[PDB]
From a paper:
Here, we report the structural and biochemical studies of the highly conserved [name] protein of ASFV, showing that [name] is a multidomain protein. The N-terminal AEP domain is responsible for the DNA polymerization activity, whereas the DNA unwinding activity is catalyzed by the central SF3 helicase domain. The middle PriCT2 and D5_N domains and the C-terminal Tail domain all contribute to the DNA unwinding activity of [name]. [name] preferentially works on forked DNA, and likely functions in Base-excision repair (BER) or other repair pathway in ASFV.
Residue numbers in the entry: 47 to 272
């Protein structure tokens, strides 16, 4: 796991035990209001992040209710499963939605983090490309006021360095976690896909759990894809 401090320009490379202590520190710094610009490199095999760059019809943030976010989780999981990469059995994967604080001149954004589902970069690009054939996702975004529902998912989401939670550019404010969902898929019951909001998200180390390269989270336990 490699970390980039865009403020000090320095780079890092930590082990599991160290990372958690690294993330323990960063988490402390987060709950103290410190401004951070930490990025993690996705590498070639890690969690998935979807970066949505929204152009809006008005200058007000979309509502993005949990009912809508739950719908997007289902659609995103369909394209994940369609990549034919999930392992057999019953497994728990988590979706996290971090949102831009405010709409600025009609521009808005949100990130969908599935940090525990470790997969290859080629698999991520296939899912990202497949997610743009999805008329249901486009309609959902359209009903939210998004002016570019056909071109809002950044194709480089599979390779761009990913901001750690609480980090931002020296000019911008960091994205804020709105809610997170728990999805359970079972190869012995493929039609059953329960999606529910995670209980007590605030009780976890958010920097650690949402990390795409972390494998020692408490809530987010890794599920390795083919
Ligand atoms: Mn963005
Ligand atoms: Mn982008």
């Amino acid at each position: 796991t490699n970390i980039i401090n865009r403020i000090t320009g320095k780079t890092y490379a930590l082990p599991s035990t160290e990372l958690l202590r690294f993330y323990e520190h960063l988490e402390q710094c987060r709950k103290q209001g410190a401004l951070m610009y930490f990025l993690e490199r996705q590498g070639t095999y890690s969690g998935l992040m979807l970066d949505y760059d929204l152009k809006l019809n008005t200058n007000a943030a979309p509502s993005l209710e949990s009912s809508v976010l739950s719908r997007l989780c289902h659609r995103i999981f369909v394209h994940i499963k369609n990549s034919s990469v999930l392992p057999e059995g019953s497994h728990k994967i988590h979706f996290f939605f971090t949102l831009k604080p405010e709409a600025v001149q009609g521009k808005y954004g949100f990130h969908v983090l599935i940090p525990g589902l470790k997969m290859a970069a080629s698999t991520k690009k296939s899912i990202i490309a497949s997610l743009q054939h999805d008329a249901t996702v486009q309609k959902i975004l359209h009903e939210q006021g998004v002016a570019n529902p056909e071109s809002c998912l950044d194709p480089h989401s599979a390779s761009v360095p990913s901001l750690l939670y609480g980090s931002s550019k020296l000019n911008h404010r960091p994205y804020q976690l709105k809610t997170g969902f728990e999805l359970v898929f079972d190869s012995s019951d493929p039609d059953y896909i329960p999606i529910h909001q995670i209980k007590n998200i605030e009780s976890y180390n958010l920097v650690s759990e949402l990390s795409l390269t972390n494998e020692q989270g408490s809530l987010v336990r890794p599920v390795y894809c083919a």
